[model samples]
Target: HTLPANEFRCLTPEDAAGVFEIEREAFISVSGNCPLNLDEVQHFLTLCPELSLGWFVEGRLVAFIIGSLWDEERLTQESLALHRPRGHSAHLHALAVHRSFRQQGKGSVLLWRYLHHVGAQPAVRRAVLMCEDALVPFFQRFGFHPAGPCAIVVGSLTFTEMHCSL
Candidate 1:
């Protein structure tokens, strides 16, 4: 069930089970498009502590956003917790919503929360993500413009880079 828009909070370890549930549900729906097995998220949460954020409505988890903090150096699992130096930026790994709650702004709410959470930190000046060509317009609403060539590496998907400046 969903609730009115006022009650939402960042997720905690106590909410891991629910977060995993929603994560599984949201990713599994993509099938060959982007099949993320449950173990990946479990391992991600275990490795990266505070980067994953979710929103709860009426005490039920409804949406989430996952970002992998990175630098040109390497893709450390805990990189999200590592502070960026001046003039550097990070990337957004994923954003998801419960199937029943897709059109209710939960995705954007969770995204905004993460943006605010990451942007408030002075070191993080920009946020970037990749999206399928078909979904580019959806993300465009969130202020991401197209960039560079499409990375069509996995499962015949073409990806475009989208960015938001903090």
Candidate 2:
């Protein structure tokens, strides 16, 4: 009904639902795990909006990413909930593209933009995240390298720790 349109910006409290909706379908439905639950999504957004980004087309959220600052060598359980004010590393929490738009390059495009945005911040020297083995190579496409196994585990799931210097 509308012509093609898009907006890319740091998310706010009002965007929590949009982020959660896509994540619910993308991660929760598949793996029974969500990187950031609805409340976690709100947590970073309220505390560090600048570290979040959402891609919207015709006012509908198509993809999103949320991150917080960290001052550690690897992602620990604490890093999942804390945003260190003096940290130099950006800990990426979640990156999800809505189901309807999956595999169309939306997620990849958003990551490229998010990397530039995060790297541009003066205090941020690097970015880090954890993913399943299959995604290790995928994240590597963006220059991420494995740092060994992640310290956090949810249920029976384990992840490969990764980082990229900005």
Candidate 3:
């Protein structure tokens, strides 16, 4: 579906740096956690081919979602891991929509686009993600149900895991 006038594009290996800048700016003010640097993002892009980077207007990198394959038989966040083993699922490990356009549904647009891709992949059995407490209801709108575990290592950095069957 066309989301108003916004556009979504997949970034190549060459575009990772510029998009990483947008990823950095989008996370600074909101997430008090460590900044998402170019090194981390560069490594992540190398490991995950399902990365989707969406740009808005002409210059604004409004939204981005990165997905990694997972499997019931094997699961790990190792940086060197490549395509998931057979019978694998997909996880939405990272998603950010520029704060300047937060309420304009940019995030949902990006998420749905990712979901469409995952759902179409025959190898994907499920799609999972962790959303902050306040945003659980928002994800529920897309049929994500809370059933798995949640976590937080530091104070108030809450996480609620949710999954959707594709």
Candidate 4:
């Protein structure tokens, strides 16, 4: 399916609240997980604003992907907490599609663009992410393979780790 026309751009710290809201809603209803606070969201943006992307329709955010750079070959407790500036891998920290825009394939479009952008970066050799079991297949369809279980736990849940070579 063709993606709807939307403006794509790097999200800044100012966009953290909107991004946090999407993450908050999605985590509560769909993932049943704890959502990051606005501070943490802004922290990630501040660390690597260039890696975070937002999709805006009519000048409002509808979908987004928050990312970070990591130097590790696999996700660990430390990598989850901060981005390694000299890292050679991309870490997709969060992806959320607003409730009003879900099921329209906007998530895939954002993901496709993010993956392409990261792959084209000389410093990013691969990409990794942690997702709930139910969503593993969705990410796998995009060439992400199961790397194993995620070491980072949020609330009471541990995620499945997946990776894609750039």
Highest TM-score: give the candidate number.
2
Q: List the residue pairs that clash in candidate 1.
A: none
Candidate 3 lands at a TM-score of: 0.76
Residue range 1-166, candidate 3, lDDT tens digits: 3445655676555656765666666655457553236665565567665544565656556777766676653223341133454645676656776657788877787778878877777788787767677878888887788754454242456567787787
lDDT of each: 0.61, 0.92, 0.63, 0.86
Q: Each model's TM-score, in the order given?
A: 0.72, 0.96, 0.76, 0.91
Tell me the number of clashing residue pairs for each predicted model: 0, 0, 0, 0
Best by lDDT: 2
Please give the RMSD to the true structure for each candidate, in Å: 4.6, 1.7, 4.4, 3.6
What are the per-residue Cα lDDT tens digits for candidate 1 across 14-55?
666676676666665554433234444554455544557776
Total residue pair clashes for candidate 3: 0
In order of TM-score, best first, we have 2, 4, 3, 1
Model 3, C-alpha of 23: deviation from truth (Å): 4.0
lDDT of 2 by residue, 22-125 (tens): 88888888889899888998999999999988988988989998999999888999899999989999899999898888999988999999999989999899
Pairwise lDDT winner, candidates 1 and 2: 2
In order of lDDT, best first, we have: 2, 4, 3, 1
Q: How far is candidate 4 from the true structure (C-alpha RMSD, Å)?
A: 3.6
